[PDB]
Paper text:
[name] is a highly soluble globular protein from the PAS domain superfamily.
The absence of the chromophore and nitrile labels did not result in any major conformational changes in the protein structure, except for a lack of density in the disordered loop region (residues 16–20), which is located more than 20 Å from the chromophore pocket. 24 The current simulations in the absence of the chromophore significantly favor decreased hydrogen bonding of the nitrile to T90 in apo-F92oCNF, consistent with the IR measurements showing a blue shift upon chromophore incorporation. In the case of F92oCNF, chromophore incorporation appears to increase its potential to form a hydrogen bond with T90, whereas in the apo state, it remains largely isolated from such interactions. Structurally, the crystallographic data seem to suggest a slight reorientation of F96 toward the empty chromophore pocket and slight increase in hydrogen bonding population.
Author numbering:
A (entry chain B), B (entry chain A): 4 to 15, 21 to 125
The structure:
Amino acid sequence: VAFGSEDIENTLGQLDGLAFGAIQLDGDGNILQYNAAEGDITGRDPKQVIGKNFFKDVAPCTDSPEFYGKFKEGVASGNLNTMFEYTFDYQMTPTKVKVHMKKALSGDSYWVFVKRV
Amino acid sequence: VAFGSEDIENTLGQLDGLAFGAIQLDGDGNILQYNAAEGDITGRDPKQVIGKNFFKDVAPCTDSPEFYGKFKEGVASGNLNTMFEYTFDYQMTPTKVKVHMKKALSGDSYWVFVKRV
Ligand SMILES: [Cl-]
Ligand SMILES: [Cl-]
Ligand SMILES: [Cl-]
Ligand SMILES: [Cl-]
Ligand SMILES: [Cl-]
Ligand SMILES: [Cl-]
């Protein structure tokens, strides 16, 4: 599975097999899944972040119109398929990434994919 | 495949599917393979490091009796299966890892497996 691929939500244990970070959020922004690659990139513990809020608890630098604001618009409208660059920084070393956020096929969850730039 | 597993060299595209860093070295310490997870952990570019020396070029903090010295003894003797903690630092943010070094099944290459502590 390639980062950014048009069919990524269709294709999506095995989550840890992805070569890039993958976080599954619900519409409230709480973490349902968080793979090994995302812990590799950020130093956050995949076990500790499940059930926490991505935008308000785990990665508060993302609580901005440029990231959380896009997520909330996407959840409200059902239209979410966006790539952009961002810097993660909270309680970690500042790390520049490329982010792809996309609504899941079910419409009940939302994916955040991450790779280092 | 679990980090540290007794049969890891037997089990070892697919390399990027591993949930932890994996580097294949030859007996001279030059890099033959370097997976996505190791780039995720360190910020080093998996494309750029192939054919470079791990101990002298890519990760010179490892040029120590505690890491390179164990590698050289392992290559010389054929006996290499060791776990230890280490900090990577060269041209990156200091990152504490657990390392497992093990001779490959063929005896012509040597694996370095890495996870964040
Ligand atoms: Cl809010
Ligand atoms: Cl952050
Ligand atoms: Cl994260
Ligand atoms: Cl280093
Ligand atoms: Cl490395
Ligand atoms: Cl030397």
